[PDB]
């Protein structure tokens, strides 16, 4: 989300993906592994936070007949204190979880980027904006070989090295 200047609004298939522009045409295919990884992590956060409490609290006040003024002020004091505690814990919880979610997803993006970067050793070079310039015409079958992590990092070495 840094050097990637913007996201792809047309990418409606997954959370991550590739958009290759070779000679044969163009392609935009979503990567399933990283997308499912971030989805499983966020789903873990959701399953962890959305929770039912088995602790039962009884009625300590009375809405129809007000209790003693002193013990009533003590009850309202304690209830207001606990309300402040849970408000703070909920605010800080939501904030921290959102931060770790954002940085987590960015971490997955960088994982994918450096993974495909490690797939192309000397046959391609970084461009700066999240692209890998290929020094040899990589056909659509070659692009599909890079997507499913089957691109041979040596059977295209000399050709791209000459370029």
């Amino acid at each position: 989300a840094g050097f990637i200047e913007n996201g792809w609004e047309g990418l409606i298939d997954g959370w991550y993906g590739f958009r290759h522009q070779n000679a044969q045409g163009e392609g935009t295919a979503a990567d399933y592994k990283s997308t499912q990884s971030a989805i499983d992590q966020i789903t873990g956060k959701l399953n962890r936070l959305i929770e039912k409490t088995n602790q039962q609290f009884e009625l300590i006040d009375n809405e129809f007949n007000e209790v003693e003024k002193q013990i009533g002020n003590v009850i309202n004091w304690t209830r207001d204190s606990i309300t402040e505690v849970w408000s703070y814990n909920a605010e800080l919880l939501v904030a921290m979880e959102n931060q770790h979610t954002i940085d987590l997803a960015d971490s997955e993006m960088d994982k994918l980027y450096e993974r495909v970067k490690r797939q192309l050793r000397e046959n391609a070079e970084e461009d700066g904006t999240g692209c890998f310039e290929i020094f040899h015409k990589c056909d659509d079958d070659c692009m599909a070989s890079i997507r499913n992590n089957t691109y041979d990092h040596s059977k295209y070495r000399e050709e791209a090295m000459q370029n």
């Binding site: 200047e5 990567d31 956060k45 039962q56 009625l59 909920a90 939501v94 959102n98 999240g130």
Partner: protein
């Protein structure tokens, strides 16, 4: 070959440890606000007291005649409920209310008191049934004739069950010192309740009170919890509302105060005066006094949890 992440045109702003308003792809809610304006009692034995007050179920006014030996897992108190038919008041009323809310119902048992030499059918136009009556579980002991003399009587009751017994008696306060002699004879006039833990001791305080229920006399309702094999003794000679049946707690339940209808199709464990909070979220912003198994109340109206990546659209 390039590679990037997805993005949406309309993200959802959330709050983070660093910034405030970071637009992510998707986000959900953690603070519940939707309320069901009904008391969800599906699968629970529910008693809607209605016009009957919770404490009256121990003394038995007319409006509580159908709640003398109730049994429930959820007790609902209504705003039109009344604990008394003859104008009176309970001492330590809220503690007894909190005892009866989690009592799981009450079971009455005859105390066996029998009387000789006085009148026992004291009744008032306020506690009307067929005609003028009194508290169902109580006895308004009068003099035998219109002034007469009230002999010193002593009545003892022993708890012979494995659970504590709820004993409730009353001290009568007439409109004046003279009507007190009309009901129990001239002079004083002393009541004495005793147990192993308890002992007291009442002298009637006759006088004019504010007209409640068209009467200026009051009745003080007192109570104590007898332990098994303990005995309570009543030595009196006038102005005594004697107990006729003791109460025993059935099991366990929950008490709520609401003003909405009862629904037997929805199910919930979080209740308040406005209805039932049915949610799976850890927080709620509906009622701070919600009872049962509720989410934790917070003052924030909305706290959006991020469920997507950082939305960097174009």
């Amino acid at each position: 070959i390039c590679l990037g992440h997805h993005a949406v045109s309309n993200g959802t702003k959330v709050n983070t440890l660093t910034e405030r308003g970071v637009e992510v792809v998707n986000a959900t809610e953690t603070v519940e606000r939707t309320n069901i304006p009904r008391i969800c009692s599906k699968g629970k034995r529910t008693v809607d007291l209605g016009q009957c007050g919770l404490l009256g179920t121990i003394t038995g006014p007319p409006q509580c005649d159908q709640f003398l030996e109730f049994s429930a897992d959820l007790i609902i108190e209504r705003r039109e409920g009344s604990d008394v038919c003859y104008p009176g008041k309970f001492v330590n009323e809220e503690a007894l209310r909190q005892i009866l809310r989690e009592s799981g119902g009450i079971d009455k048992e005859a105390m066996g008191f029998t009387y000789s030499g006085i009148r026992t059918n004291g009744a008032t136009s306020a506690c009307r049934r067929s005609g003028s009556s009194f508290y169902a579980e109580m006895k308004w002991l009068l003099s035998n004739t219109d002034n007469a003399a009230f002999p010193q009587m002593t009545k003892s009751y022993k708890n012979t069950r494995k659970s504590p017994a709820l004993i409730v008696w009353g001290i009568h306060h007439s409109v004046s010192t003279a009507e007190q002699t009309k009901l129990y004879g001239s002079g004083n006039k002393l009541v004495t309740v005793g147990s192993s833990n308890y002992q007291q001791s009442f002298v009637p305080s006759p006088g004019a009170r504010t007209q409640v229920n068209g009467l200026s006399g009051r009745i003080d309702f007192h109570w104590l919890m007898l332990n098994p094999n303990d005995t309570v003794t009543f030595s009196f000679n006038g102005a005594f509302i004697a107990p006729d049946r003791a109460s025993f707690l059935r099991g366990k339940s929950m008490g709520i105060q609401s003003g909405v209808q009862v629904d037997a199709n929805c199910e919930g464990d979080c209740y308040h005066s406005g209805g039932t909070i049915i949610s799976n979220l850890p927080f709620q912003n509906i009622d701070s006094r919600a009872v049962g198994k509720c989410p934790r109340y917070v003052k924030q109206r909305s706290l959006l949890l991020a469920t997507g990546m950082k939305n960097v659209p174009e």
